[PDB]
Design a protein around this ligand. Sequence first.
Ligand code: NAD
Ligand code: NAD
Ligand code: NAD
Ligand code: NAD
Ligand code: MG
Ligand code: MG
Ligand code: MG
Lengths: 331, 330, 331, 331
Amino acid sequence: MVIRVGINGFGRIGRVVFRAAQRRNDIEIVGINDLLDADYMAYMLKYDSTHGRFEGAVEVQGGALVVNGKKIRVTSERDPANLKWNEINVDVVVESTGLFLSDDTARKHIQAGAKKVVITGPSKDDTPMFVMGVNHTTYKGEAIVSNASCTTNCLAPLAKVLNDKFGIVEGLMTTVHATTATQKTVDGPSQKDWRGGRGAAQNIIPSSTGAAKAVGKIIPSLNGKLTGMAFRVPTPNVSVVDLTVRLERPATYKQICDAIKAASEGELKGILGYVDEEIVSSDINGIPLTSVFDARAGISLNDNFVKLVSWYDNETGYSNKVLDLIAHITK
Amino acid sequence: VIRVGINGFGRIGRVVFRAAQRRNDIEIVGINDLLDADYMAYMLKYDSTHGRFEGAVEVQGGALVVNGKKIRVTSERDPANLKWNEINVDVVVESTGLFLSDDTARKHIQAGAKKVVITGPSKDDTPMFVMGVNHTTYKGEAIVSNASCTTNCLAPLAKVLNDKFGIVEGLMTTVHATTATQKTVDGPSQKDWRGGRGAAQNIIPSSTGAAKAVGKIIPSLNGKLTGMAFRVPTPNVSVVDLTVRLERPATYKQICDAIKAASEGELKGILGYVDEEIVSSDINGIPLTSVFDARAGISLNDNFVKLVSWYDNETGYSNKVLDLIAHITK
Amino acid sequence: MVIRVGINGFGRIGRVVFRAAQRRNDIEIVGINDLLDADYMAYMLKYDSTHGRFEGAVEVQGGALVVNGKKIRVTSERDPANLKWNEINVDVVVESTGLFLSDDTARKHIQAGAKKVVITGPSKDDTPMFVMGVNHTTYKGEAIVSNASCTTNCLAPLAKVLNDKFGIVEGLMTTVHATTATQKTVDGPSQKDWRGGRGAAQNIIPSSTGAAKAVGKIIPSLNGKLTGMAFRVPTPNVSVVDLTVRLERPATYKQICDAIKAASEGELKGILGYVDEEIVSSDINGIPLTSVFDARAGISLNDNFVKLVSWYDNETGYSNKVLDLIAHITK
Amino acid sequence: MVIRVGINGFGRIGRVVFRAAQRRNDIEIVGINDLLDADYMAYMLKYDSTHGRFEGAVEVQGGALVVNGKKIRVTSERDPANLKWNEINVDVVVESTGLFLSDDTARKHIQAGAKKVVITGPSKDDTPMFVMGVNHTTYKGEAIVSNASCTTNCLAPLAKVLNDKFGIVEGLMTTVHATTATQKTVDGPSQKDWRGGRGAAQNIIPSSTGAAKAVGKIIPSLNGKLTGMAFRVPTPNVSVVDLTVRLERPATYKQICDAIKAASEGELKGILGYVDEEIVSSDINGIPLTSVFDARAGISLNDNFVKLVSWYDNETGYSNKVLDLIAHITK
Ligand SMILES: NC(=O)c1ccc[n+]([C@@H]2O[C@H](COP(=O)([O-])OP(=O)(O)OC[C@H]3O[C@@H](n4cnc5c(N)ncnc54)[C@H](O)[C@@H]3O)[C@@H](O)[C@H]2O)c1
Ligand SMILES: NC(=O)c1ccc[n+]([C@@H]2O[C@H](COP(=O)([O-])OP(=O)(O)OC[C@H]3O[C@@H](n4cnc5c(N)ncnc54)[C@H](O)[C@@H]3O)[C@@H](O)[C@H]2O)c1
Ligand SMILES: NC(=O)c1ccc[n+]([C@@H]2O[C@H](COP(=O)([O-])OP(=O)(O)OC[C@H]3O[C@@H](n4cnc5c(N)ncnc54)[C@H](O)[C@@H]3O)[C@@H](O)[C@H]2O)c1
Ligand SMILES: NC(=O)c1ccc[n+]([C@@H]2O[C@H](COP(=O)([O-])OP(=O)(O)OC[C@H]3O[C@@H](n4cnc5c(N)ncnc54)[C@H](O)[C@@H]3O)[C@@H](O)[C@H]2O)c1
Ligand SMILES: [Mg+2]
Ligand SMILES: [Mg+2]
Ligand SMILES: [Mg+2]
């Protein structure tokens, strides 16, 4: 059974989701909505500064996008209620504009004829959030879900392994994060995030994030036990989680590594990765894992206090798991 | 003292504001953007490119207080509603990047201002000026343009060469710093596809009418110059790369001597002359609009030469905007 | 019939040459020399910030490099004379240290048992230089050759088309060039190139280059008709030639484009490329062409005075042509 | 009363120490040693990508540097033993080559006629290290001292306030650090630090650092209670400490801020600073403080577990405190 999917917001996540969908037989992107002509949309798909040339055929024929022989409806509707998803029989919508992160806005896709919606960001409201490999089995057939944030998808699988094996008393996270689309090339206006308005190439830019706290929803036993912040730094992609955590039961650094390696080859296979090499961020570019543990980078103070490092391609990992979630909620 | 309002407190708007603090003939009395006063104070106080504001800044009752002087802060999206007359504004610096024509910029005059300086090249037949090159052609027009940063770098250089040796024809490249219109990662730029690609990752080609506009600034060079741009990942300071054919032969030393002479005479404070192993950040903060790099350029022969001139695209332009304000009110 | 190659200098060119050689049947790398342990060389091959992970297996067995199961001798000899190339029966050495750009230094590989040497930079002496597609047929069986510079391999094919079709009166070139290994992260010492010592990430940095003048040697009819300079800018790879040229016979921009396009499909196929799209530098990353003409980027003042833009991956294009030159000089 | 100082190693620290010395009456730089001609040294002093044009007058007269009316001897001795510091009556040598971080090597300055030496890095041996404002009063008249690291100088004043007021149970530190001269523009050789060889502009690059552990020597009561690591990111200057710490006595975030503010106005005035604004890294560029507490950036999980953020200009702050140490050890 092939799932028919529409994308709203053909941005970094929308376009990276699109490419990943191409390598799957169970998902077909049959419609795309943004504020772009079909020919510009084709160009943005074909050429990518971060992930290179698109491996496939793209043509524009009569205002529709034709990719690898398939016609894809292209629209320019600012209001999702007008998207008429039913006319192309769309099952699930990828909501990746970054503008519609609540039930009252995202449900407009269902009003427009879609059956289900995956929001590609943290919920503004009580829309349930999921992290593949951590709490996806708690899905109950809801029509609208959230795939949480890229950072939460990095921290939660790491947090799960530790909490399961040793238990987490409490933790503080820093994510050192690549530049994103919300940032500015030179000091410019960001009325709700003053620091985020400062030139991205020139600065280390601190930021607030609810991603560590959000892990409390993904892993309920950790509710109120984790929080943190971020530094935005001048790279185009790939980010890293820096988790300082207190453990319930003692664990040597080797034992933590053995536990992470085991989960990476067992239950968290294809989600959590294990690396024991001298890597740097660009070595992670293109990796579809959502959490890549860096064994050599981290350090133990003692058997109950440890700093752990995990990489994530914030575009690619998240995007592949958006597709995993689509397959899961439709199974 | 000329009372000035700024529309668009962006890179140019704010660098103009700082430069004005160091002028005795100009006072900024109103600023319009889409910002609260406290955010506006913050953007002024801290600058990634030019450092901490060299003055006192505070907010008192929804007004900006800078060096003890009160400045009206508004958030009118439509310039027609700016009520410049209520703070007795003479001239408006139009630096939003949105109003580059007579019909749009004239809304400031509808709103009570007397004159308007547009801080970009005109979209229509609004006259453009480059200080030191054609500013004496100003005829009392109420609305003028200060052209572009690139034109302000190229025109003084072209003038010196054209006056002394004459220019047959020339092609220009500007290697340009990143600007606010660009994107941090590949994003939407429907009218400029290349410019939408991530700025930090790329050398990004661009069209520019900046060399061709020198034809309007120096009429004898009409149809004799054109060029393009490469946008590269630096935050500020740009450089002009002019390949030019000369009418009368000149050695490289002779070209340099003419430029040096002009920089000490008629073009003092506009065109500069440097004879050192400099790089772009050495030009950051320089108020000149054209800084000739003697050592960087090269002659093929006595009639064919490549000349290099730096410009702080924020600071030089911004200072000459203020020079143009003083000139058109003189 | 397969040419056995040794690499001296496993730097950017050595390693990109190595990767290009993996996809060729007529050339195999059997030895590498640098100042590195075998396991560090393996790491440098495996992970590449610019060109991503090595597409294959890399391992160390007994002080040797094992790539896709094939053993490669690893040595650490500072003096090329001690390399014992005869012991692994190397035919041709890729001299890519950047230190040995003369007959006197490079011939030490021949003393050490190699038959021929390709120097991967411009000659300091009268060692003959070549650009594939332009003057490679002038090769006369010399034991030591140079593949000229990356910039010269971009300019010469473009200059050749213009010169052949319309004739070049005079020309001035600018290359806007990516950062390279000789540059500095922050202002540091560069006694023979002061500008080049200034922080690379912070600056546009003017530079001298003999690349346009050297095209006068590659294309003798253009001797004394070309020169230029460079600006080094903060990108990691891919550079662009900016050629301002006066033509003998009149040509419209379309006629110039048609000529370049025809050559790219004919005589200069696989050397000179033709692009008619809104590309930026990163789109050229990984392209094995030595010159990629950007039709939309350039501009004519008139039918005899024109500015032409041509891209080049300064690592990949040059490296592939080093291998093309090796194949040619042994044929 | 005026201390006569020679600088060995006119690099980033040497040149920034030099400028800071111009604005002090109690310190005179009377000699500089590097591997540079006098005119190149003049140029390196005059133009600085990070801190702008030098404000004073600089000239070369007969192989000597003349700055603001004072003559400065320029030498090119690779071996410090030959520096003849006595011929220009040098009291203290600033040892900032980065090569001589032990008693055996730094003592060559004393052989060469100097009375005392300040090493501008952490000691490799048992050479005593100091952080101004924290343990400088433990100085006992030693001829050779170390000013520790830039990172230690940021952490120790912050850790001192917390330990004094609330007590530190344990802590783990991350420093997000600007690029330095030891790094590479593109993937290059770094045999003793593989990650550090990777292209700095392209990467977030993890690194080990003993700076947190070293605070155990600066503050003995904290021995074994702190350690940490680093991420090197592509900015030219200014770094930030990210300290996750468990407190003995409970404290609100407000209480932590008030305690740090009080110290910044009292005992640690001019050493530790307090900022309550939406700043980013470039706002700290040029600040001579060694630790600038960012009240708004940090976050508490609870009253005993907190993450604290403190900035530092790694060139300027450290360089100023080098001079403060010179003033102190000669009083
Ligand atoms: N980039 C990451 O690493 C990352 C990771 C995880 C989650 N996210 C989240 O995904 C969402 C999008 O992120 P992004 O990086 O792709 O941003 P983006 O700016 O690159 O993409 C947003 C796209 O939506 C388009 N758009 C804007 N308004 C629209 C409208 N009314 N209707 C239809 N399309 C519209 C825009 O043209 C743009 O192309 C955000 O919520 C983000 O927080 C991003
Ligand atoms: N940055 C340069 O180097 C440079 C040099 C010369 C000329 N210019 C030109 O100056 C103009 C502004 O350029 P910039 O770099 O300062 O861009 P910018 O984006 O930094 O500044 C634009 C400012 O205008 C504000 N604004 C947007 N809409 C507004 C509205 N309706 N009303 C009032 N304010 C509004 C924006 O919030 C922003 O602060 C452009 O036309 C530009 O081409 C720029
Ligand atoms: N990078 C480019 O874009 C490019 C293009 C064309 C030509 N070239 C030229 O090729 C040559 C190499 O350039 P690069 O960018 O690869 O520099 P690089 O620094 O990246 O590589 C040089 C390598 O040689 C090693 N080496 C140094 N001394 C050695 C010795 N005595 N014996 C053996 N190995 C030694 C070094 O450890 C290093 O790994 C230069 O001449 C360069 O100008 C470079
Ligand atoms: N840069 C920082 O942020 C920082 C902060 C604190 C401490 N430090 C430390 O200070 C020391 C220098 O740091 P840096 O950033 O200034 O490095 P740097 O590379 O900028 O300076 C080193 C200087 O020493 C010169 N030199 C090399 N060998 C020499 C020799 N035999 N004799 C005389 N001079 C020689 C070099 O030419 C160079 O100019 C290092 O130990 C560093 O860890 C650096
Ligand atoms: Mg599919
Ligand atoms: Mg092969
Ligand atoms: Mg002094």
